[PDB]
Design a protein around this ligand. Sequence first.
Ligand SMILES: CCCCCCCCCCCCCCCCCC(=O)OC[C@H](COP(=O)([O-])OC[C@H](O)COP(=O)([O-])OC[C@H](COC(=O)CCCCCCCCCCCCCCCCC)OC(=O)CCCCCCCCCCCCCCCCC)OC(=O)CCCCCCCCCCCCCCCCC
Lengths: 171, 63
Amino acid sequence: PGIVELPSLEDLKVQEVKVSSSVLKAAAHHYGAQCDKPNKEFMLCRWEEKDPRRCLEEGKLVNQCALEFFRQIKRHCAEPFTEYWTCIDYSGLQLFRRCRKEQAQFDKCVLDKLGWVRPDLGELSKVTKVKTDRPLPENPYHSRARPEPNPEVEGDLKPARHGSRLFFWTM
Amino acid sequence: DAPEKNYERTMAILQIESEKAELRLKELEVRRLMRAKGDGPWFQYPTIDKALIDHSPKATPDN
Ligand SMILES: CCCCCCCCCCCCCCCCCC(=O)OC[C@H](COP(=O)([O-])OC[C@H](O)COP(=O)([O-])OC[C@H](COC(=O)CCCCCCCCCCCCCCCCC)OC(=O)CCCCCCCCCCCCCCCCC)OC(=O)CCCCCCCCCCCCCCCCC
């Protein structure tokens, strides 16, 4: 067949969000609140193109907007966030429910210094709409032309010409 | 019976039987070509209904 095209290693260099999973899980509700638009443009491009090579730049925007999400935490509320993700980080299942007062301190300092409202129960699971400028893929599966169907039956049904025509049976 | 009656009755019998014999040979040839090519209404062995395919957005994108 053909050669599969791959992007170069410079096309894959972006500054990584090099924080732990409890750090990501601690700020995840405010992350889904504040980093909505580039994340949803990326996941729309990712379910529509069905190809990650066509989804690099939007992904870079994700990694552009996540870092600016954490810098904006690090400039303002580094200590209550640190006290919060440490308590998230203790738990083996990483329970939100074991960590409600540290969550309250982090949410208080974030609403005071950044004005961010934490999403409620049922908001980040909504199907939202995304206004992009990229065109709709007319053939995301790269499917070739389908075979033409067999001709259907038409014409009025006539009797059998002289019956069964089986050796001597005249009907 | 008159010789006219037997004669013309014989011609009608011969018309019916010649038409039936030509139609039997055409039936053989039609079945041969429809088994060879599969483009007629016979020998249409079933395939999978494509209405069974779930075209919803799935859990992972790459599919
Ligand atoms: C206005 C609206 C109302 C109008 C009303 C008008 C009518 C009023 C009267 C009402 C009654 C109508 C009767 C039926 C129509 C006429 C049927 C007919 O004569 O067919 C001729 C038919 C062929 O002749 P034809 O010149 O081509 O057609 C003239 C008509 O146009 C015949 O028409 P066709 O050209 O369209 O024929 C079609 C085709 C013509 O046939 C063909 O093209 C050839 C294929 C025939 C079958 C061959 C099979 C051979 C191997 C098996 C042999 C079995 C053993 C033999 C019998 C042993 C005992 C059972 O038929 C078939 O293929 C079907 C099979 C044969 C059925 C015949 C009727 C049987 C009814 C009574 C059953 C009693 C036993 C009869 C004999 C059974 C064996 C057949 O003759 C035969 O096949 C030979 C058998 C004899 C005919 C049956 C006669 C029926 C009356 C019998 C009374 C006596 C009974 C005694 C006691 C019982 C026996 C022990």
